[PDB]
Amino acid sequence: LNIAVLLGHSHDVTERELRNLWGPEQATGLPLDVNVVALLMNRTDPKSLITHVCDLMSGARIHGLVFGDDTDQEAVAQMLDFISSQTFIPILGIHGGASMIMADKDPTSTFFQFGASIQQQATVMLKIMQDYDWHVFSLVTTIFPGYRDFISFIKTTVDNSFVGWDMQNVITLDTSFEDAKTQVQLKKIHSSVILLYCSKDEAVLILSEARSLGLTGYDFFWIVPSLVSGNTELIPKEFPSGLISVSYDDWDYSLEARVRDGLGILTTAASSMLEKFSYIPEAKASCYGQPLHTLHQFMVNVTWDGKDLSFTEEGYQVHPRLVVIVLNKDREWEKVGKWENQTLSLRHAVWPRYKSFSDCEPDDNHLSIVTLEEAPFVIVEDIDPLTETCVRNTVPCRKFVKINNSTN
Amino acid sequence: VLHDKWYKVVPCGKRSFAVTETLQM
Amino acid sequence: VNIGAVLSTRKHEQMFREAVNQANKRHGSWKIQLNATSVTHKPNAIQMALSVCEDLISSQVYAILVSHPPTPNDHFTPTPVSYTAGFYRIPVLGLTTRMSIYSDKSIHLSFLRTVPPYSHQSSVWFEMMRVYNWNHIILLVSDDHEGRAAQKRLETLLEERESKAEKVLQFDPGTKNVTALLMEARELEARVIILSASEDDAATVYRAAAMLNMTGSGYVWLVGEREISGNALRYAPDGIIGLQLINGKNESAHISDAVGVVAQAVHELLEKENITDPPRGCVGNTNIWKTGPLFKRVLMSSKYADGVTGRVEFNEDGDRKFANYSIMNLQNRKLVQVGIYNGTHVIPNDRKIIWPGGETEKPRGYQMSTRLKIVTIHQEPFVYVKPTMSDGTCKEEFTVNGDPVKKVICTGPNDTSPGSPRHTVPQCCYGFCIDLLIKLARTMNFTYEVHLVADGKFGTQERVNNSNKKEWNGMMGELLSGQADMIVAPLTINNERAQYIEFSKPFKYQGLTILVKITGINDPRLRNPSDKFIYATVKQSSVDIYFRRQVELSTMYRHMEKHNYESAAEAIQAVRDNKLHAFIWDSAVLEFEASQKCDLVTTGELFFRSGFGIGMRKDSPWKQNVSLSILKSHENGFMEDLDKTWVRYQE
């Protein structure tokens, strides 16, 4: 039916190419009122979004208003949650403020975001850290929603993992720092891995404080979740080259890459559950005065193009196509691999040395050792496959054994 | 430390507690 | 200095106008120039949110007040105003709702209130519980959303009190099949009913309990602020503890208290520096308030010297200031009251607490549950596992001594673990622990449930997992939970094995003894093991903890952890058939082996002399009876009889 793709991102992309997307995306004659529209929210304020929603609701009861942005904002997420709770419409969060994962969502809300959840991000970052034998981590949370669940998931992952993990004291950034009570806490942090679960501005401030107080070295590897790198067009200069950014999407998975998938899922759910509700596009008349067999909680199992895009009780892709990239030298996100639904598909298995993260790093203390197979020396063995990891006593050796002679 | 200093030689010092059952026969 | 307000009823608007007109500068000393404005709530949630976003943040407001009962969201909570003002760190006064989920600082950055949420009610209940020693309580919360947080807070406070409850889980929101859990609670420690659900969800439980005559003595019903109103007073038993906070019921008094708190906050903000205005929320403006964390700190992290309530020690979460309570009792819907909480400790009022049981003194709340799970563990010196003579009937034999042998119906495996995995045949067990159990059963009357456990290991904390968390396993993990608190086994109390629970009086001091085929600890053979010196003892026993504490037997511990077997029958049969060399256990087993077998030297070499106490729970009203029975058995002539029949048994 009607697919209201309200693209509220800052980029002024041509919206004319969105009306003809009904053809390749399951062009079926069953939907009658296919009122496909597309807007462009210029002013970044909740008032403009409220006015646009109230105008679209008056347009013959537009149903299924998919919204998406370019920058993750906490206000847009709460606004869309309130809209999905009041109007009860199956919104599809694509990117930006529409994909900001919260701590506790409403049960009646149909906010279906695209990407990975906090537990999936914790799992993939733990896999990345264990693939490089990095157990000295330092978790730093903030006041943004998703800190207690994150620390609980971290503690749960440390418990079942019996290979040793340095659990340092957790630094909280709920209150504003005055460089008088947080510098002493940051000075005691001696671990290499620095789990920085904060926002963009908070991460920039932390990096600035680390550069001003002499905390940035050749051994500190900062790791940020998808909440920090929630965009592919704005990169600050305080972040050094080598910042592991595990983002749920990148320039490859742009807005148009997910708009077609969302439209296909919506039309598939409509064609599947149309026999229950004949008049699916039934919403409120306007914003003045104004679940049994609808399409609210009946689109959490549509498998589009084989991708496991099923949603949880709150609504989130269980197996997203997230791409893990790092920061290059010329302020650009250099791709190093991705994560599949089965396991972690790390393309760049060889971790670069990164002797100079920022520009003012003349220290170069990265070495390299080569060894061979000897009988009286260390016996060449394999890694323990019971947990796909090993212990600190067994140093992970980067093997180079080929499968066949003719193969390269 | 001064008290527990002249107890070096102990023929049955820690063996005297075995009185409940039979000894080595 | 502009301050806004958002109400729905005309009475609230008039009260706010009067509060900002008269007695508005009394709070503090600085002459404030606030510009109070009020916005009427719209029937639609979207239109009201738009009006808020176009008026309040555009007029640079500092605080608001939401106290109207009929919210336009039909959920009794200010959802749109909070979700719109949370971006600018605006302290949305959500004093109209008591939901503990919304009061959390996780999903709501700046959202305070002046009404005790479910968390504060649970805290007050926990404070009232520790006064009368209410440790083992039950939670009948049927609600899920806020009930989860309520039970989480309850169990965390119970763990902080060095204890653990029994029922902290939910069953179903508004169900009618609670007869099973009620009948199970009829034979528990305390009858304190903890219900923190909504109106109908609590009324269903009330009527279900009334249909089963659940209105006896000892039922302490803890209700909230909006759980008994309108019609829930009839379904609930007469005499419930109705909690009520000052300026919580009256709307005018609550609005006045909120205005006073806002005035005190504004005065404290004006006292310090950095007096900046919030960013105006026009089109395209996405600025964050710079003085947001500082405002949160001066709101909840600081204290208040004055105000309407005139109290100190404000909570660190912005939920409700700890002050005096106005808890009124509802005995047949009268003006009676019970002990109120004065912010720091409950102080009794003029008239004492009236209980629905019939009396006025302390009722029979702390009741000794007759259902006591008596778990039977296979022991070497005491427990003598043998097939039963008759089907489900044991024959009590009588030896040549003066102590009769009483065989109990121990339901469990008929043999060891390698022999059979697990059986349910009620065989017959007899021993020192069995005689003590019979004495305790004939002394005090209680419904004992005997059952032979499968494994025979003690379950220490050396290499265990326990769902990847530091707890006990085997037969001791259920002791801390509260199911099987009485274990008939001589647990050696010499290390941190008994640091959680207190045992009874030690009846024997034989300690541990080694076996010879290593004749003493001074010999190098016992210190340094070999290929033939096997130490196949019981896995995860007190010997493991003793070897962990000792640092001079590091070379011995390497040949000790990898040799301890899980079972003990195979070990004793091997050490009896001249296979094993060293077996560290009690002296009674070695004495029996030396009496039945003359080829064994059995030098003993025992030097531990450690006590043996019956494993019992620390917080239980039955641990004194065990000590009294031990003292009576020691002062009487049964001690030497039991010794000659079990420990020193010659054939």
Written overview of the protein:
The structure is cut from a larger assembly and holds chains A (408 residues), B (25 residues) and C (651 residues). Chain A has seven helices and 13 strands. Chain A is α/β, with parallel strands linked by helices and 408 residues long. In chain A, a hairpin with a 5-residue loop joins strand 12 (323-327) and strand 13 (333-338). Chain B is low in regular secondary structure and 25 residues long. Chain B has no helix or strand. Chain B is elongated and about 35 Å long. The termini of chain B are far apart. Chain C is 29% helix and 9% strand. In chain C, a hairpin with a 4-residue loop joins strand 12 (340-341) and strand 13. Chain C starts with a strand and ends with a helix.
Question: What labels describe this entry?
Answer:
part of a larger assembly, 3 chains, A: 408 residues, alpha/beta, eight-stranded mixed sheet, three-stranded parallel sheet, 7 helices, C: 651 residues, five-stranded mixed sheet, four-stranded mixed sheet, 19 strands, 29% helix, Glutamate receptor ionotropic, NMDA 3A (chain B), protein-containing complex binding (chain C), phosphoprotein (chain C), zinc (chain C)
Main sheet overview of chain B? none
Radius of gyration of chain C: 33 Å
User: Strand order of the main beta sheet of chain C, please?
Assistant: 7-8-9-10-11
Report the structural category of chain C: alpha/beta
User: Count the strands of chain B?
Assistant: 0
PDB class: membrane protein
Keywords: membrane protein, ion channel
Entry title: Triheteromeric NMDA receptor GluN1-GluN2A-GluN3A in complex with glycine, glutamate, a GluN1-specific Fab,and a GluN2A-specific Fab
Chain A: Glutamate receptor ionotropic, NMDA 2A,Enhanced green fluorescent protein
Topology summary:
The structure is cut from a larger assembly and holds chains A (408 residues), B (25 residues) and C (651 residues).
Chain A: E1 4-7, E2 37-40, H1 46-57, E3 65-68, H2 74-86, E4 92-93, E5 112-113, H3 118-131, E6 136-142, H4 148-160, E7 166-167, E8 171-173, H5 183-188, E9 193-196, H6 200-212, E10 221-224, E11 244-247, H7 255-273, E12 323-327, E13 333-338
Parallel strand pairs in A: 1-2, 1-3, 4-5, 6-7, 6-8, 6-9, 9-10, 10-11
Antiparallel strand pairs in A: 11-12, 12-13
Helix pairs in contact in A: 3-4
Chain B: no helix or strand
Chain C: E1 2-3, E2 6-7, H1 10-21, E3 35-36, E4 39-40, H2 45-55, H3 79-85, E5 92-93, E6 111-112, H4 118-131, E7 138-139, H5 145-160, H6 179-185, E8 193-194, H7 199-211, E9 221-223, H8 232-235, E10 241-242, H9 251-271, H10 293-301, E11 328-329, E12 340-341, E13 346-347, E14 371-376, E15 408-412, E16 425-429, H11 432-443, E17 447-452, H12 477-481, E18 486-492, H13 524-527, H14 542-549, H15 554-561, H16 569-576, H17 587-596, E19 612-616, H18 623-635, H19 638-647
Parallel strand pairs in C: 1-3, 2-4, 5-6, 7-8, 8-9, 9-10, 14-17, 14-18
Antiparallel strand pairs in C: 10-11, 12-13, 15-16, 18-19
Helix pairs in contact in C: 1-9, 2-3, 4-5
